[PDB]
Structures are given as C-alpha cells and as structure tokens.
Amino acid sequence: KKFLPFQQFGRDIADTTDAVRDPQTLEILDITPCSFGGVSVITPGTNTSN
Amino acid sequence: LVRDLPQGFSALEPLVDLPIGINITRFQTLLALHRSYLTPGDSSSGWTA
Ligand SMILES: *[C@@H]1O[C@H](CO)[C@@H](O)[C@H](O)[C@H]1NC(C)=O
Numbered sequence: 548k549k550f551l552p553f554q555q556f557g558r559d560i561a562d563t564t565d566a567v568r569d570p571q572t573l574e575i576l577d578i579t580p581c582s583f584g585g586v587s588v589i590t591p592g593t594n595t596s597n
Numbered sequence: 598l599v600r601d602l603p604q605g606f607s608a609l610e611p612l613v614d615l616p617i618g619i620n621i622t623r624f625q626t627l628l629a630l631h632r633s634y635l636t637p638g639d640s641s642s643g644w645t646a
C-alpha cells in the first residue's frame with residue numbers, strides 16, 4: 548500500500564486498523580490479527596470409547 | 598480547449614496545514630503585472646487581454 552504524505556493509519560473495513568505507517572522507519576506495514584478458529588471435538592459414544 | 602471549468606473528477610490532495618491561528622473573513626488574489634503602470638501601452642503590453 549502507498550500512504551499519502553499526510554496518511555498514517557489504514558482502515559478499509561472502518562472498524563479495524565489493517566495497515567499503519569511505522570513512526571521511525573517510513574515503511575508501511577499491515578496488521579493481521581493473530582488469527583483464530585473454532586475447535587470441534589469428534590467423538591464416538593463414551594459408552595463405547597473415549 | 599476548455600474555456601470554463603472542465604467536466605470530470607479530480608481529487609484534491611492536501612498540501613500543508615499551517616498553524617496560523619488567525620481570523621479570516623476576506624481574501625484577495627495577487628497578480629503579476631508584466632506591463633508598466635507609468636506608461637500603459639495601447640495594446641499587447643499585457644498578456645493577450
Ligand atoms: C527517525 O529515526 C529513525 C531511527 O533513527 C530513522 O529511520 C530516521 O532517520 C528518522 N525518520 C524520520 C521520520 O525522520
């Protein structure tokens with residue numbers, strides 16, 4: 548992404564800051580959340596096996 | 598070849614934010630005079646009328 552000289556932050560979705568400009572080095576880096584995901588357990592009956 | 602304001606879309610990019618902190622109500626535009634105020638020519642001394 549290219550930030551205009553006045554631009555500092557990035558919000559394409561308007562409720563999360565996807566990208567930002569580092570204050571020391573003028574490179575622009577984008578923030579991806581640390582990820583997530585549902586966890587499902589597939590089990591037969593405990594009357595049969597655990 | 599467009600005398601008036603052209604038809605189209607151009608987004609204006611910011612230039613600078615001056616912390617002047619003053620009160621502004623009126624403004625005026627400064628021009629450049631190529632001709633002479635002491636001796637005004639009959640014509641063409643200025644820029645194509
Ligand atoms: C800010 O300092 C950093 C680290 O010293 C360096 O990348 C750069 O010289 C400076 N950048 C700016 C914004 O002046």
Ligand SMILES: *[C@@H]1O[C@H](CO)[C@@H](O)[C@H](O)[C@H]1NC(C)=O
Nearest residue numbers: 617618619620621622623624
């Ligand atoms: C600016 O000046 C006008 C008078 O020309 C006055 O009425 C107005 O209150 C002033 N505004 C500020 C913010 O000083």
